[PDB]
Design an enzyme around this catalytic site. Structure first.
Site, PDB file in Angstrom:
ATOM      1  N   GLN A  40      79.374  23.546  61.890  1.00 49.09           N
ATOM      2  CA  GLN A  40      80.060  23.698  60.586  1.00 49.09           C
ATOM      3  C   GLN A  40      81.525  23.322  60.569  1.00 49.09           C
ATOM      4  O   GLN A  40      82.023  22.757  59.779  1.00 49.09           O
ATOM      5  CB  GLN A  40      79.729  24.952  60.181  1.00 49.09           C
ATOM      6  CG  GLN A  40      81.012  25.707  59.276  1.00 49.09           C
ATOM      7  CD  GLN A  40      80.416  27.179  58.790  1.00 49.09           C
ATOM      8  OE1 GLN A  40      79.356  27.679  58.952  1.00 49.09           O
ATOM      9  NE2 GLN A  40      81.421  27.682  58.171  1.00 49.09           N
ATOM     10  N   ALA A  42      71.619  27.323  65.875  1.00 54.85           N
ATOM     11  CA  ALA A  42      71.259  27.900  67.035  1.00 54.85           C
ATOM     12  C   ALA A  42      71.732  29.294  67.534  1.00 54.85           C
ATOM     13  O   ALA A  42      71.538  29.620  68.416  1.00 54.85           O
ATOM     14  CB  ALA A  42      72.208  27.133  68.055  1.00 54.85           C
ATOM     15  N   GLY A  48      76.902  27.623  68.229  1.00 50.75           N
ATOM     16  CA  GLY A  48      75.934  27.427  68.960  1.00 50.75           C
ATOM     17  C   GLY A  48      75.656  25.669  69.082  1.00 50.75           C
ATOM     18  O   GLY A  48      75.347  25.142  69.986  1.00 50.75           O
ATOM     19  N   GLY A  54      77.954  23.557  68.184  1.00 48.34           N
ATOM     20  CA  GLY A  54      78.783  22.774  68.655  1.00 48.34           C
ATOM     21  C   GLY A  54      78.887  22.621  70.193  1.00 48.34           C
ATOM     22  O   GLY A  54      79.495  21.784  70.927  1.00 48.34           O
ATOM     23  N   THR A  73      85.722  35.744  66.315  1.00 47.05           N
ATOM     24  CA  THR A  73      84.850  36.028  65.145  1.00 47.05           C
ATOM     25  C   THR A  73      83.204  36.203  66.041  1.00 47.05           C
ATOM     26  O   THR A  73      82.585  36.739  65.045  1.00 47.05           O
ATOM     27  CB  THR A  73      84.948  34.823  64.197  1.00 47.05           C
ATOM     28  OG1 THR A  73      84.521  33.856  64.911  1.00 47.05           O
ATOM     29  CG2 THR A  73      85.919  34.946  63.613  1.00 47.05           C
ATOM     30  N   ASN A  85      92.457  28.059  66.029  1.00 48.40           N
ATOM     31  CA  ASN A  85      92.829  28.906  64.806  1.00 48.40           C
ATOM     32  C   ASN A  85      94.255  29.535  64.847  1.00 48.40           C
ATOM     33  O   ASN A  85      94.977  29.812  63.919  1.00 48.40           O
ATOM     34  CB  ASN A  85      91.875  29.173  64.263  1.00 48.40           C
ATOM     35  CG  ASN A  85      91.000  28.108  63.562  1.00 48.40           C
ATOM     36  OD1 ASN A  85      91.440  27.005  63.351  1.00 48.40           O
ATOM     37  ND2 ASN A  85      89.574  28.515  62.979  1.00 48.40           N
ATOM     38  N   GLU A 138      95.581   2.682  75.416  1.00 50.33           N
ATOM     39  CA  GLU A 138      96.929   2.912  75.808  1.00 50.33           C
ATOM     40  C   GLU A 138      97.033   4.565  75.845  1.00 50.33           C
ATOM     41  O   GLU A 138      97.979   5.005  76.641  1.00 50.33           O
ATOM     42  CB  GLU A 138      97.658   2.261  74.757  1.00 50.33           C
ATOM     43  CG  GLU A 138      97.580   0.661  74.807  1.00 50.33           C
ATOM     44  CD  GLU A 138      98.844  -0.099  74.012  1.00 50.33           C
ATOM     45  OE1 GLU A 138      99.901  -0.044  74.572  1.00 50.33           O
ATOM     46  OE2 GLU A 138      98.537  -0.577  73.071  1.00 50.33           O
TER      47      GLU A 138
HETATM   48  N1  LIG Z   1      89.864  25.497  62.051  1.00 48.82           N
HETATM   49  C1  LIG Z   1      88.575  25.638  61.628  1.00 48.82           C
HETATM   50  N2  LIG Z   1      87.581  26.183  62.455  1.00 48.82           N
HETATM   51  C2  LIG Z   1      86.411  26.376  61.943  1.00 48.82           C
HETATM   52  C3  LIG Z   1      86.238  26.006  60.600  1.00 48.82           C
HETATM   53  N3  LIG Z   1      84.871  26.352  60.126  1.00 48.82           N
HETATM   54  C4  LIG Z   1      84.394  26.894  61.359  1.00 48.82           C
HETATM   55  N4  LIG Z   1      85.400  26.984  62.259  1.00 48.82           N
HETATM   56  C5  LIG Z   1      85.197  27.604  63.657  1.00 48.82           C
HETATM   57  O1  LIG Z   1      83.686  27.557  64.041  1.00 48.82           O
HETATM   58  C6  LIG Z   1      83.492  28.755  64.745  1.00 48.82           C
HETATM   59  C7  LIG Z   1      81.954  29.208  63.954  1.00 48.82           C
HETATM   60  O2  LIG Z   1      81.000  28.344  64.510  1.00 48.82           O
HETATM   61  P1  LIG Z   1      80.029  27.426  63.633  1.00 48.82           P
HETATM   62  O3  LIG Z   1      81.103  27.047  62.647  1.00 48.82           O
HETATM   63  O4  LIG Z   1      78.963  28.044  63.105  1.00 48.82           O
HETATM   64  O5  LIG Z   1      79.755  26.113  64.543  1.00 48.82           O
HETATM   65  P2  LIG Z   1      78.247  25.745  65.093  1.00 48.82           P
HETATM   66  O6  LIG Z   1      78.219  24.829  66.165  1.00 48.82           O
HETATM   67  O7  LIG Z   1      77.568  25.188  63.892  1.00 48.82           O
HETATM   68  O8  LIG Z   1      77.535  27.227  65.458  1.00 48.82           O
HETATM   69  P3  LIG Z   1      75.903  27.735  64.800  1.00 48.82           P
HETATM   70  O9  LIG Z   1      76.195  28.010  63.362  1.00 48.82           O
HETATM   71  O10 LIG Z   1      75.497  28.629  65.678  1.00 48.82           O
HETATM   72  O11 LIG Z   1      75.153  26.238  65.088  1.00 48.82           O
HETATM   73  C8  LIG Z   1      84.396  29.785  64.513  1.00 48.82           C
HETATM   74  O12 LIG Z   1      84.895  30.177  65.966  1.00 48.82           O
HETATM   75  C9  LIG Z   1      85.502  29.212  63.682  1.00 48.82           C
HETATM   76  O13 LIG Z   1      86.733  29.252  64.622  1.00 48.82           O
HETATM   77  C10 LIG Z   1      87.336  25.253  59.930  1.00 48.82           C
HETATM   78  O14 LIG Z   1      87.044  25.037  58.588  1.00 48.82           O
HETATM   79  N5  LIG Z   1      88.266  25.243  60.473  1.00 48.82           N
HETATM   80 MG   LIG Z   2      75.605  25.251  63.370  1.00 47.61          MG
END
Ligand SMILES: Nc1nc2c(ncn2[C@@H]2O[C@H](COP(=O)(O)OP(=O)(O)OP(=O)(O)O)[C@@H](O)[C@H]2O)c(=O)[nH]1
Ligand SMILES: [Mg+2]
Ligand SMILES: Nc1nc2c(ncn2[C@@H]2O[C@H](COP(=O)(O)OP(=O)(O)O)[C@@H](O)[C@H]2O)c(=O)[nH]1
Ligand SMILES: Nc1nc2c(ncn2[C@@H]2O[C@H](COP(=O)(O)OP(=O)(O)O)[C@@H](O)[C@H]2O)c(=O)[nH]1
Lengths: 427, 430, 108, 193, 427
Positions: free
Chosen positions: B11, B90, B135, B137, B170, B197, B245
């Site tokens: 996300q 995940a 998860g 990511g 979080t 963040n 580079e």
């Molecule tokens: N800087 C920034 N961080 C984000 C943003 N959206 C989500 N995050 C980061 O993403 C993390 C939340 O996990 P997910 O966004 O659900 O990532 P994921 O790999 O999809 O995890 P799953 O939902 O379990 O599949 C948090 O720790 C946030 O810091 C955003 O719009 N900007």
């Molecule tokens: Mg996800």
């Protein structure tokens, strides 16, 4: 496409279920005749989670109603939202509840179990996907305590993967409606611990406490009492139904808050709550919501956190609101009161955000947490159980059904260890 | 001509991708539908009789974030194959996103990414985005990187990831997913960027005057960083820098690659009217710890080779004078075996403002990517957090039941320990 | 509300009737004391009419109906009046009465 | 390009999303003047979640421009204007009525009647047949698919009249063909089936 | 131009036939006065299949009514649609039925047979083409069982090529009306086996069971029982009357379903059936229809197929509906229940798609299948017939008419091999 199947049981579950379906129907905008008459397109985005569509634009929820006597069902039929439910989903017996756990489990449970299971299989295998099941029942009663635990075992056998999140009402310690509560609650504990993934405990004494103190109602009715419970149920599934800055579904909730398989009992609460005269005066921002959620008076379980320690905690927010302000509160409330958290797990507070708040409320929040304060709750029932069990006689009405007296020892054996299980992990 | 393929996971990756491609559309002057009212080829393909389609693939194991793009304003820009959505996420679990549910969808996505490369005659690398705590990511990103390593070999795989914040958190299980993904990334990535963040929240509030930001503001600043990095490949200039580079000049060793990022000037409209924003003025601002996109103080460590990228009015004179002034700072430390320490690239295209934008229209700007031993501070905090959870085995049952063998927990722990040894062994002078 | 005015000393008192489960502290709304209008002038019998909006201390109240003896004394001062406008219904009370209607009304 | 229609559109986005701007626009007011910088207003609008177009921006900036400064926008006036669309704050004064919950909430017909002829003769139900293409349950599909399903039923009408139906039954937001009300109108003119 | 001539024997045939001619009069839009007052041009495409025209715009049916006593005819005359029939097509005797097969076959059968045949000749040789004849009669009585089998032999002698499709009602064991039904059914079966191309079996037990289970009718009369039967025979000939994507008439059905000349007794099934208090909530789709047809409870023959194995099966569909959606269900339902199908014939499920559905229903389906479960049906009568043979029971009533006692021996022997014939093909 993460459909959720909703199961009700008995007098307690049916009244709560009836009120609960009013909340979601209003939230999505479903007319009591079953036809959508809402106000926005987003309500139709993922209405498939709780509703099925019948040819004609009429939506019917995935609801199953279970009872041993028809009296509760007929009240639901005459209710305001009675026309909504599918007529075949009403499964009922023709015998009294009996207020006995053994009778509901062995004598009348078996006949209803096979008829009910086919009804579930209709809805369970009718949708493209099914995330988990949802159970609302009481443990002090006869039908929900006895038959509800029996169905809980059968659901796990057929569908191991799905989430069996349950909402339970625990017998009140001070004054309650039933003499034989200690047996039914104690016997039901063993079935709940091994089978259910998630357990939320709700006490009527806490609900009465909130109605006086916060809502300033002179005569709290079951309608107001059931309303507060229903709003918690809508909050947990809100992430699935609507978009948000950070999605958090049921399986995310269980992974974070459950460090070990048997430690999964939770206490719940909701903010904001305000008396009808005070809502003019009350400013409502992010810090104001966080104040209530961790405040002990807002807990819907009569278990004071300060006497125990926390293990995990989760908070959900609804409405457009600053991501920084939510994350800052979680850090402060954890650092400010470090005496009430375990050192060996850092970052004990999980967070989540949803885009759309409930009607009328610009922002709202829901709290689910795990703590060792449950040791107070099961201490009360165990102490009362010991006094009654030494008196061998009241078991008479349980033995005639076929319940062996050893089952009471095994029932007392397991939750005693559960109280112990919370004792050692405080260290 | 010379193109770049971008992939977004999780996300965080999708939302960052939303802002970044928004910046690309208005910077080249492309309408949301793909029409026009140059370097288009580097990021877009001409297909629809007036229409351009971006070279992007969006992946998530749950439909909500992708469906926002599907229902959003920019929906007509993307080919439907480019937006891939799973069925159930995940659940913030590395094991579920890598073995059980990740392998359900891994071979679907690899077809689309290989298909888009066929049209790409001049592919020079991939840009990859992650959220380490998530998860998808971590678990899915590791599975995707492992396959892409053997599918293509000597093609640059650059990463731009969201490292966990020092104290802001979080997700409870965040330390577990970060360490497991660390072993996968270190071997397969050519060069991996990190931001967090917590450092962003401080920056978009102090220098940019915003009381209470959202994730939208943070993503827009991230978009500016990527645009400046790719500006050398897409616009006129006096000193161009290619993917090869940055990578050859920033990484002295194989496992040392990890750089840190910063951007200057970051400033509001009212403040911009009062200052001159000279080349030395913007250059001096980068080196302060306050402007850093990662909450680590360089004064704790030292500096290896650095890269500077200028856009617009900049003249090579003031670059050399400013860099010479930087060398006089005794508050800045450099290792003895890198006396040169710099590469600069100058481009003529100024940064572009956004509808509903957050920044001011500055006529000149600078971005830096630098490697420092101060990042070993970041790895130490994550390592200590992991041992506390793993000492009492707080969350092992979730990960084992979803396919992971328990032996992988100490193995990823060992790899991080070796990586920290790699940083302190190099940091010492001789 | 219930507006009580005293002919002996021109003081005024407002008492809100108590309602079941209203959720608002009900009772004496304004203590007995002489009332100064928005023009810094004391309220008098010459101000009250049946059907005219009367404002006091930031609020505005609408006079609906008068007591039987209030009607007679005002009759000797030619201030009588009958307006067809009843009190607008409270939607919140309407819905609770319907819920209480659900509990009580008719299985016949 | 219009102040009023954009104000109405924003209020509708407010009612649907249940969002109040006084939270966001009150942050930047460090002196509580009721005026903030135009560019902070621009940042505040994007933070608020609505995707305001540039054309709407300068029209808003021009209309709510201040006289005491250069390029200051009266955020309090703008915030109050949208709030008043819900309910005036002067309701402690009696007269005003609130919206309650209800105030908040020939060529074509010839083609419709011939389609009604076909459905009556065939005893069709069209609402179940378009379902293949309205993913995400928005019940609005591309014009090509809307036309394409129509002769999948088999009513080979002339090309221009089909585009006429797409023009009248257009869904303005998605620029798609809204078939929810189309199916309702079709089955109604057919009658009982 | 595939005209079908209708024959109705006995109290059972005249009641069911009268209801049947209502249904077709509804579907084509024929006024009770006998004139067209319909709504669609397609209704007049192929109305010649079942109707003739009397000069002046009046349409009459190709129906012949047969009984031994005039009581049943007068019931048909005074019905709502009674005046529709041709006056001369009523053929009746002036003697009681007697419920005696021998009396029906020999004494009164010969007298009525010659008069009936010429009436059939009038309708049989009045049309351009004649595909087959249609017979409705009962096998427990004396009129339809006795005289019906006699007419069946004479029809075959004069018209060998034409399809002699018959609809029969088996005497329900343990329930049925009279004492001597096992005698009448046993003698009639031998005539049915050799002469009739297609036989459909209907049991009164299943009609009662379906009404209580599905339609939820507390007081099921013969009006509702006959109505459900009228749908199936209406569906079978629907391919002749209306266009479709894939037509399948009687002769197609016989070729596919019949693997050997004697194994042609069939069970029939219809869907959808829904209670009038639940039809609004039901999500009627193509897979939903497939669920009902193959559900064992919807069979109007009280023979459970799961105790047997299937040989051939055929389904008919009426509606505007996807060919792929139909064709996939057959493969899925055949692959899932492979334990119930013979392995020496793959693709055991036949299909057809007709366009126009019946009134009120968006779509509907009809099932006709052949299974070894018929061994259950003939076992009940054979054992019941055996116990009346041992002590010679009522046979003296049959002897006086002219029946030789050996005729009972050959009648049982033929059925005994027929039961065996289904036994060997299970292998
Ligand atoms: N800087 C920034 N961080 C984000 C943003 N959206 C989500 N995050 C980061 O993403 C993390 C939340 O996990 P997910 O966004 O659900 O990532 P994921 O790999 O999809 O995890 P799953 O939902 O379990 O599949 C948090 O720790 C946030 O810091 C955003 O719009 N900007
Ligand atoms: Mg996800
Ligand atoms: N909160 C709440 N509790 C209820 C309601 N109705 C009944 N109860 C309580 O539920 C407990 C058990 O009820 P019981 O009828 O025995 O449930 P059952 O036998 O398991 O179906 C009783 O102590 C009741 O006081 C309700 O509407 N709300
Ligand atoms: N399903 C159905 N069965 C009927 C009807 N009328 C009579 N029967 C059954 O038919 C059986 C024999 O009928 P019977 O009077 O002997 O007819 P007949 O000998 O051919 O004239 C009886 O057992 C009845 O139960 C009807 O309208 N519907």
């Amino acid at each position: 496409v993460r459909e959720i199947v909703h199961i009700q049981a008995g007098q307690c579950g049916n009244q709560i279920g009836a009120k609960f379906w009013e909340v979601i129907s209003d939230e999505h905008g479903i007319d009591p005749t079953g036809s959508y008459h809402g106000d926005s397109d987003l309500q139709l985005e993922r209405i498939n989670v709780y509703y099925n569509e019948a040819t004609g634009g009429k939506y019917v929820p995935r609801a199953i109603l279970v009872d041993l006597e028809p009296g509760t069902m007929d009240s639901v039929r005459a209710g305001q939202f009675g026309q909504l439910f599918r007529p075949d989903n009403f499964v009922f017996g023709q015998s009294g509840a009996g207020n006995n756990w053994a009778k509901g489990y062995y004598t009348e449970g078996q006949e209803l179990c096979e008829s009910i299971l086919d009804v579930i299989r209709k809805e369970a295998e009718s949708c493209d996907c099914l995330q988990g099941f949802q159970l609302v029942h009481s443990l002090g009663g006869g039908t929900g305590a006895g038959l509800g635990t029996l169905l809980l075992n059968k659901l796990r056998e057929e569908y191991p993967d799905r989430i069996l999140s349950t909402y339970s009402i625990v017998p009140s310690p001070k004054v309650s409606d039933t003499v034989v509560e200690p047996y039914n609650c104690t016997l039901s504990v063993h079935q709940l611990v091994e089978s259910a993934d998630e357990v939320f405990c709700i006490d009527n004494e806490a609900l009465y406490d909130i109605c006086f103190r916060t809502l300033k109602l002179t005569t709290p009715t079951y309608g107001d009492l059931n309303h507060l419970v229903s709003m918690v149920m809508s909050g947990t599934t809100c992430a699935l139904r609507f978009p948000g800055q950070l999605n958090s579904d049921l399986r995310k909730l269980a992974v974070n808050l459950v460090p070990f398989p048997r430690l999964h009992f939770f206490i719940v609460g909701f903010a904001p709550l305000t008396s009808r005269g005070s809502q003019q005066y009350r400013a409502l921002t992010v810090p104001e919501l966080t104040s209530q959620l961790f405040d002990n008076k807002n807990m819907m379980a009569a278990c004071d956190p300060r006497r125990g320690v926390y293990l995990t905690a989760s908070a959900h927010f609804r409405g457009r609101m600053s991501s920084k302000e939510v994350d800052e509160q979680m850090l402060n409330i954890q650092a400010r009161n470090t005496s009430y958290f375990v050192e060996w797990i850092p970052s004990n507070v999980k967070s989540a955000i949803c885009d759309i708040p409930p009607r009328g409320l610009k922002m709202a929040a829901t709290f689910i947490g795990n703590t060792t304060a449950f040791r107070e709750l099961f201490t009360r029932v165990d102490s009362q159980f010991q006094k009654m069990y030494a008196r061998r006689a009241f078991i008479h009405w349980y033995v005639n059904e076929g319940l062996e007296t050893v089952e009471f020892d095994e029932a007392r054996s397991n939750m005693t260890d559960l109280i112990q299980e919370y004792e050692m992990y405080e260290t | 001509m010379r193109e770049v393929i971008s992939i977004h996971v999780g996300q965080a990756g999708v939302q960052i991708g939303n802002g970044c491609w928004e910046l690309y559309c208005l910077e080249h002057g492309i309408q949301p539908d793909g029409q026009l009212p140059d370097a288009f080829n580097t990021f877009f393909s001409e297909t629809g009789a007036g229409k351009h389609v971006p070279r992007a693939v969006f992946v998530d194991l749950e439909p909500t974030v992708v469906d926002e793009v599907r229902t959003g304003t920019y929906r007509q820009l993307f080919h439907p194959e480019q937006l891939i959505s799973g069925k159930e996420d995940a659940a913030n679990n590395y094991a579920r996103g890598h073995y059980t549910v990740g392998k359900e969808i891994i071979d679907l996505t690899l077809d689309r990414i290989r298909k888009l490369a066929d049209q790409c005659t001049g592919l020079q690398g991939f840009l990859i985005f992650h959220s380490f705590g998530g998860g998808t990511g971590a678990g899915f990103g590791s599975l995707l990187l492992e396959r892409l390593s053997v599918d293509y070999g000597k093609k640059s795989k650059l990463e731009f990831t969201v490292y966990p914040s020092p104290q802001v958190s979080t997700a409870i299980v965040e330390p577990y997913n970060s360490i497991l993904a660390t072993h996968s990334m270190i071997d397969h990535s050519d060069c991996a960027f990190m931001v967090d963040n917590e450092a962003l929240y401080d920056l978009c509030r102090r220098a940019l005057d915003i009381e209470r930001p959202t994730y939208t503001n943070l993503n827009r600043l991230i978009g500016q960083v990527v645009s400046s990095l790719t500006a050398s490949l897409r616009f006129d200039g006096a000193l161009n820098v290619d993917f090869t580079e940055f990578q050859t000049n920033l990484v002295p060793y194989a496992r040392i690659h990890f750089p840190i990022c910063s951007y200057a000037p970051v400033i509001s409209a009212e403040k911009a009217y009062h200052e001159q924003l000279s080349v030395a003025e913007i250059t001096n601002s980068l080196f302060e710890p306050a402007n850093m996109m990662v909450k680590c103080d360089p004064r704790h460590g030292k500096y290896m080779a650095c890269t500077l990228l200028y856009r617009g009015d900049v003249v090579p004179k003031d670059v050399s004078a400013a860099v010479a002034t930087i060398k006089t700072k005794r508050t800045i430390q450099f290792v003895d075996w890198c006396p040169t320490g710099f590469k600069m690239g100058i481009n003529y295209q100024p940064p572009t403002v956004v509808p509903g934008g957050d920044l001011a229209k500055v006529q000149r700007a600078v971005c830096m990517l630098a490697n420092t031993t101060a990042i070993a501070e970041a790895w130490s905090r994550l390592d200590h957090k992991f041992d506390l959870m793993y000492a009492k085995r707080a969350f092992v049952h979730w990960y084992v039941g979803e396919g992971m063998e328990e032996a992988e927990f100490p193995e990823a722990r060992e790899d991080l320990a070796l990586l920290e040894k790699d940083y302190d062994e190099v940091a010492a002078e001789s | 509300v219930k507006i009580l005015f005293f002919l002996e000393d021109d003081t005024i008192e407002i008492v809100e009737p108590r309602v079941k489960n209203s959720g608002i502290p009900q009772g004496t709304f304004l203590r007995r004391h002489r009332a100064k209008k928005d023009d810094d002038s004391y309220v008098n019998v010459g101000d009250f009419h049946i059907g005219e909006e009367f404002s006091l201390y930031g609020r505005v109240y609408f006079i609906q109906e008068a007591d039987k003896f209030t009607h007679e004394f005002l009759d000797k001062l030619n201030r009588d009046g009958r307006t067809d406008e009843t009190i607008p219904d409270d939607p919140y009370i309407q819905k609770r009465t319907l819920v209480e209607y659900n509990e009580t009304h008719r299985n016949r | 390009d219009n102040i009023d229609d954009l104000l109405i559109e924003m209020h509708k986005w407010c009612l649907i999303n249940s969002v109040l701007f006084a939270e966001f626009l009150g942050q930047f007011d460090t002196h509580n003047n009721g005026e903030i910088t135009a560019e902070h207003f621009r940042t505040g609008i994007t933070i608020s979640g609505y995707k305001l177009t540039d054309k709407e921006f300068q029209v808003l900036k021009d209309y709510y421009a201040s006289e005491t400064k250069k390029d200051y926008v009266k955020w309090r006036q703008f915030d109050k204007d949208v709030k008043e669309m819900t309910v005036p704050l002067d309701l402690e004064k009696t007269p005003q009525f609130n919206p309650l919950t209800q105030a908040e909430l020939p060529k074509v017909q010839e083609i419709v009647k011939e389609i009604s002829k076909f459905v009556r003769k065939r005893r069709l139900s069209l609402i179940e047949q378009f379902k293949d293409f309205d993913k995400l349950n928005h019940k609005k599909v591309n014009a090509s698919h809307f036309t394409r399903i129509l002769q999948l039923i088999g009513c080979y009408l002339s090309k221009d009249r089909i585009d006429e139906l797409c023009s009248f039954y257009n869904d303005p937001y998605t620029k798609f063909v809204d078939y929810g009300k189309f199916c309702a109108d079709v089955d109604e003119m057919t009658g009982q089936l």
